[PDB]
C-alpha cells in the first residue's frame, strides 16, 4: 500500500527504501 510508505513522518531515505522493497515485491509478482 502507498499509504504506509507515503507517511510524512518518514524521511526521504526510508520512503525510498519502502518504494524499492515494494517495487521488488511487485516485480516478483509480475514474474509470477
Amino acid at each position: 500500500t502507498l499509504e504506509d510508505i507515503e507517511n510524512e513522518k518518514f524521511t526521504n531515505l526510508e520512503i525510498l527504501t519502502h518504494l524499492y522493497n515494494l517495487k521488488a515485491e511487485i516485480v516478483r509478482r509480475l514474474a509470477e
Binding site: 502507498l2 507515503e6 520512503i15 525510498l16 524499492y20 515494494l22 517495487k23 509478482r29
Partner: protein, 225 residues
Amino acid sequence: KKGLQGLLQDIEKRILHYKQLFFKEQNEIANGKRSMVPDNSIPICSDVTKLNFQALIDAQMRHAGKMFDVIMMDPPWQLYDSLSDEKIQNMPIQSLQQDGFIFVWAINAKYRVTIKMIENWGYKLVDEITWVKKTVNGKIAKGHGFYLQHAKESCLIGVKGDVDNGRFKKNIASDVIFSERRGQSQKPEEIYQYINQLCPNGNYLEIFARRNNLHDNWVSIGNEL
C-alpha cells in the same frame, strides 16, 4: 496483469520524485544547509552508565574555569531505553557541581524518589517547576492516573554550594509552565528560558537529552544525540 503494471508505473514515478527530493536534500546538506541545532551547543552522545564523567569534569574545568551552574535531567524512569533508580543515583552529580542547581523532571511514580535523589546528591530541595499541559484552545490537557487525572509534569529543583555569588538571579521566571504537549517526552523550551533567567550566560549540563534539547551554552548528554 494490467493493474499491477500500472501500479509499477506509479511507484516508478514516485521513486523518481523521491529520488529527486533526496538528491536535493543531500545537495543542500553538503553545500551549506545548517541544522536547527545552535552553534554553541555541545552535544555528547553517550550512555551515562558508560560515560566517563571524569573527562567531562576535566574539559569543563580547563575550558570554562569552573563547574556547571545548572544540571537538568529528564530521567528515563522505569515503569526509548529506561534506567533504574539506582542507576540514575550512580551518576556522579556531586562531582559535576559545587555551586548551583539541579533540575530533575519527576513523574508521579518517581517523585519522592526524585526528592531522595537530589538529597542524596548533596542538593537541598528548594523549588519545583510544574509543567501544566495545555490544549490548542488554551485549556488543561487532562490525562490519567490512579487517583487524579495527570495533567502535570514536575521538575524538582535542589540547590547546592554558594549560589549567592552574582551568577544566579533571585525572584525570576515562575514555577509553573503552561505549555502545549509538543511531543511524547518533549519538555517545553520554557524550562530553558527559565533556567537562562536563573543563571544568565552560565554553564549548563543536560543529561538524557534529545536533539530537541540542544541549546546554546548547554552541554547535553543523551543516548540518541
